[PDB]
Design a protein around this ligand. Structure first.
Ligand SMILES: Nc1ncnc2c1ncn2[C@@H]1O[C@H](COP(=O)(O)OP(=O)(O)O)[C@@H](O)[C@H]1O
Ligand SMILES: Nc1ncnc2c1ncn2[C@@H]1O[C@H](COP(=O)(O)OP(=O)(O)O)[C@@H](O)[C@H]1O
Ligand SMILES: Nc1ncnc2c1ncn2[C@@H]1O[C@H](COP(=O)(O)OP(=O)(O)O)[C@@H](O)[C@H]1O
Ligand SMILES: CP(=O)(O)CC[C@H](N)C(=O)O
Ligand SMILES: CP(=O)(O)CC[C@H](N)C(=O)O
Ligand SMILES: CP(=O)(O)CC[C@H](N)C(=O)O
Ligand SMILES: [Mn+2]
Ligand SMILES: [Mn+2]
Ligand SMILES: [Mn+2]
Ligand SMILES: [Mn+2]
Ligand SMILES: [Mn+2]
Ligand SMILES: [Mn+2]
Lengths: 468, 468, 468
């Protein structure tokens, strides 16, 4: 929308333009330009900027990259005081201009191209269910003499005892209590509803909202699926709207996977299906109404799971969630019934809506990278006709070791997930989607994060070992 | 009102739709959907959702159920910020679609069907008097090192001594003092009146309101009776309006049966009568203007009392109320005079208003389940011509052991009430209204709640036993 | 000393007898008996007691074991108010009476027997350097809403800024500053000297004491070596004296491996050598004055390292220490020079003192188990002539990846060390020293400890991931 955008500036008396793009870890970045700085060439050649002080784009020598505006992504920021227009950008290589090896958005697009290229399908569909928490106060820190973390929300079950300024009104969700109680137990209708209204104003399509299992404000807003790349965009918008609406209500939102222990962690399940000329390639006559195609996808996903983990579970914390008992599946199996399975097959009337849901991904995942990895492992399962085996229609979390069931499982730690992506990197490099250093850079970043957690004493260690 | 609802969306520029239904324990649940998500098929096939993380619907394998909107139940939420429409839903079995075994609302409907089926009558009438308290502050908790509870209201008699920011204005209801003093002793006219206005706006019909016996804000709002199922609906609305209006006035409401000790507990008396073609089957020429029919109903209720208790007194706390001296009857007898009797026969001019009042039910009861149990025990008393014996026209609470009167009485504890429902489950399974696992599931839930109270040391035990 | 002990009761007007023994994790346990309860048979048949409520001896059915006093171990407790005599006991199987499979002390003795049995040598020598810290205040905890740890000592470098009641006297050890400054920088001469005096009074032989590298009171007391089993005894006494003298000085001691981060962790290096008829089998004409024998020992130790880790590094915290830069070697190599090597060969004048020092063990290790594992891996290296390869005389911590040196290294985590001991369990079962369930029980215990740390969110995760 080069043209569309120009009209849109006059239509909203736009004063600024916010250029946004996404870094390797997944954090959305931005830069502001006065509306007058937006002209003809701005669209065809973008603007100059130094990526050097960005995570893993480093190159305090060569990485002077280009921000390439995407006329289609334009939309007003609903939080900023002065009328500003947001425009998602792509990171292009200077001069060459075809797309940075490390730009996650470019990588996602590359993967979408390769899909049409292998002729397997013409569009990928993603529908993620990104969960989160809403707190009132969050404090933490680490120093040589100690470390800590403190969470607090009005909904926190621990506050049943707490004294309040104007009295304790006591209607709080108990542990795992947070599912669907009517207000006042659910302090957040009005909040979620805003996030919804806003998200829609920003282009997303809201299917629904509701409180979620855990005490202390766990909530979820369900949004309608979309083409893989546009969806990862929407995810960033989602998080923004969430983070900010929360902020504006004097709350603080977090998409971290396992903030509290002992309370059903926040996760981002991934619904997928492939299409070709308006037809859903995932419907057929095999298990649950699935096509042959889908099962190969499943086989791929299951094969490359640990590697995919590194993208869809990029945090040490991610692994604190992936445990039995909290609606977090670790078992690399599929089923329409059994919910101990990380891949669940939604049962549904028509064939138009047949698909798969890969439940192990969490919020912290870089949408673009995570989605691509899912897609590429799916394609590899198809090309190589990888059979997913038989569906799990047995028992839930720890009924299994009756024959000590050791069926495939997601990565146990982050080091694992990483090292796996190191080795099993082949399916990602296909179609030149992922490049080696793009992948080696990511591994490096996460490796240093993992170091911190692995090296800093944990409070519990004192509980367990001080009196040793 | 499939049609009606659509018009109602445009009429109120409705932005959202709140789907509400009721869980096993009785807690109303909800989920929000954008108004645009409401279409043609939404009404005929409902929406999909996982019940797994709900009390006793568990089935982390098969329980992927359907929310079936009931076009008639539609009404605006008066508390939500963005214009939203509420719609009560039924929980249907996927595919089969005729009604979940454990959906309390389905069970209530089943029981109403069975009434017309036995041809005994064509409609059941329920008129409950649900009492409650309004506090300013409520705190409590239990940990290994102790436990506690602290209540506080501006009306609390204990505050006669308390120092206040702008001075203590001292007009408080004494113990059992809270009946009908004119303000300012009664700090709640304006509050109750709101609850009334609102309740009416939400479809209920208010007959009256007044403060109630106990100090510390006990209050009651009397609402007009209705067909058994529609009434249990109204109860949920009632509680909502109460809970929320209270909240909005900086108060906190509780429908728990016995919050404080030493002060006439909150209860939900149940007025009932059966009808057939506009005629009141409960009027006749026997005791107090009653029909033969009514007395068989009474006999049934009295026979199945302990089992009914499990539904109409689902809490350990419920049994802290059922004691002499606080207008809580334990004696399983009937009378128009003596108010020591749990069933009281309201005396009234015409025959059009003849009925019975079963006083032992409390607030905590799942309306649907509780009502059904009452109805089914009534029907069983009729089919089997169970005679209620002679009316109690003697003395009140402890004049009786003169011949150590041991006439039938309501369950002494919860374990009892439960175990009773276990055994005497037959009259409930009639007409396939209650199913075994529906009943076995309920018992299980309550059994774990009872465990907690039974296993956690009580403060009083220290008072009584520490120096042992 | 059945006889000796009796005289010793009259000699000190002993009032009580403290029976002590050691649990699986390594924690010394005790039970008190009046001196009069000590008689003739007490020595030959011990006393009865239930082990059931002890870590991994569980058996709430069969584990009613015997405490078998060891007349030799008798010595007065210097801290107890009433004159009491301590007596180390062995845990024997009831009736059979030859020694519990899980009694770590029995296991240590078994291993010493097997040494003389293989005729390889007649006595094993252990000289451990167990380091520790002395704080003034230690607080920590974990709950659903958070977790934390707080360390504090008068020596803590962080206190340079801290305000004190009678003024801040500011002579504190900086980070890694804590090595040998003269008081007042070293607030602990008098303290260590007491621990020394006491330790000696309790039978140990003190070679020396000194402050140690880390700020916040890290200290060490060097004690003279002894026969493997008697030494692990002395370790327990050591820790006791330390823990208690500290306590009595208003301090609090901890032998946990890595309390603080950023400051040279506390470790327990293990000097070893074998003997036969007063001759030191570890001296020869090979590297550094070593015998052939020693190098096979080294080879064994290096081969079984990861398994040995599970015994000599039983804590998740243990692995927070095993990192470059803090005098904690991870490299499974030997050298007399290079101190990047986990096995260091002390250079020394005579042959009488030739030996090896395995530096990776830490304090938290169960002396008995840890020592045995070291010994058994040493013996296996000898029987199977396992060559230790060439000594490391190269560069320190990260000069190596020049050819990305991947020489053998100690376990990276605890799960690893455990799983390793699972598999490589063979050399331990030799001579029936370690039994399968003895080993399977240990693994189980530690597995649940590891679970806690692995499952509880770490403060740093918030620092790193909250704003994700
Ligand atoms: N191919 C597809 N056809 C239809 N819906 C899809 C498809 N691929 C993904 N979806 C997504 O399914 C998700 C929504 O439903 P949700 O109620 O949150 O399910 P769950 O019960 O698993 O949490 C949306 O993101 C929806 O758009
Ligand atoms: N069949 C019936 N005919 C008339 N009123 C009925 C019938 N069944 C139930 N009722 C109910 O009696 C209740 C109201 O009166 P209330 O003043 O609160 O009495 P009480 O003095 O026992 O607290 C209402 O719920 C009313 O609608
Ligand atoms: N066979 C042996 N002959 C002599 N000393 C030995 C032998 N085996 C172990 N040792 C022990 O070496 C340890 C002491 O010295 P230390 O000064 O703490 O050394 P480091 O500089 O490595 O910390 C003691 O525990 C000592 O008794
Ligand atoms: C589908 P659901 O709502 O039961 C929850 C998933 C869980 N929050 C997660 O951590 O994945
Ligand atoms: C009819 P009423 O107003 O005298 C009171 C009943 C009593 N609150 C309850 O616990 O049942
Ligand atoms: C021999 P040294 O005094 O230099 C120290 C060893 C170190 N504290 C550890 O963690 O082993
Ligand atoms: Mn969810
Ligand atoms: Mn889902
Ligand atoms: Mn009343
Ligand atoms: Mn009444
Ligand atoms: Mn040292
Ligand atoms: Mn040393």
């Amino acid at each position: 929308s080069a043209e569309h955008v120009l009209t849109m500036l006059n239509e909203h008396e736009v004063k600024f333009v916010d250029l946004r793009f996404t870094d390797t870890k997944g954090k959305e970045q931005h830069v502001t330009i006065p509306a007058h700085q937006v002209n003809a060439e701005f669209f065809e050649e973008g603007k100059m900027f130094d990526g050097s002080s960005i995570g893993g784009w480093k190159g305090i020598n060569e990485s002077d990259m280009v921000l390439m505006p995407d006329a289609s992504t334009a939309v007003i920021d609903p939080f900023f005081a002065d009328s500003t227009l947001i425009i998602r950008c792509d990171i292009l290589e200077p001069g060459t201009l075809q797309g940075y090896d490390r730009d996650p958005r470019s990588i996602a697009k590359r993967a979408e191209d390769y899909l049409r290229a292998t002729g397997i399908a013409d569009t990928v569909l993603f529908g993620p269910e990104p969960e989160f928490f809403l707190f009132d106060d969050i404090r933490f820190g680490a120093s040589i003499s100690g470390s800590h973390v403190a969470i607090d929300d009005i909904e926190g079950a621990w506050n049943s005892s707490t004294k309040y300024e104007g009295g304790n009104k006591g209607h709080r969700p108990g542990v795992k209590g947070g599912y669907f109680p009517v207000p006042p137990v659910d302090s957040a209708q009005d909040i979620r509803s805003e996030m919804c209204l806003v998200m829609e104003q920003m282009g997303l399509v809201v299917e629904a909202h509701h409180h979620e299992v855990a005490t202390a404000g766990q909530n979820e807003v369900a949004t309608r699926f979309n083409t893989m790349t546009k969806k990862a965009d929407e995810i960033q918008i989602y998080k923004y709207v969430v983070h900010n609406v929360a902020h504006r209500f004097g709350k603080t939102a977090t998409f971290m996977p396992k903030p509290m222990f002992g309370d059903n962690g926040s996760g981002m399940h991934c619904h997928m299906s492939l299409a070709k000329n308006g037809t859903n390639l995932f419907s057929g006559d095999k298990y649950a109404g699935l096509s042959e195609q889908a099962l190969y996808y499943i086989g791929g996903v299951i094969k490359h799971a640990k590697a995919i983990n590194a993208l869809a579970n990029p945090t040490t914390n991610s692994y604190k969630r992936l445990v039995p008992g909290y609606e977090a599946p670790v078992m690399l199996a599929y089923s329409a019934r059994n919910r101990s399975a990380s891949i669940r097959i939604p049962v549904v009337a028509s064939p138009k809506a047949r698909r798969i849901e890969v439940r192990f991904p969490d919020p912290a995942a870089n949408p673009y990278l995570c989605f691509a990895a899912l897609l590429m492992a799916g394609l590899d399962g198809i090309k190589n006709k990888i059979h997913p085996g038989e569906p799990m229609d047995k028992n839930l979390y720890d009924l299994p070791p009756e024959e000590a069931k050791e069926i495939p499982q997601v990565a146990g730690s982050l080091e694992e997930a990483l090292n796996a992506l190191d080795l099993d990197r082949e399916f990602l490099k296909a179609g030149g989607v992922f490049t080696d250093e793009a992948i080696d850079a990511y591994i490096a970043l996460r490796r240093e994060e993992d170091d911190r957690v692995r090296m800093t004493p944990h409070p519990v260690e004192f509980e367990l070992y001080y009196s040793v």
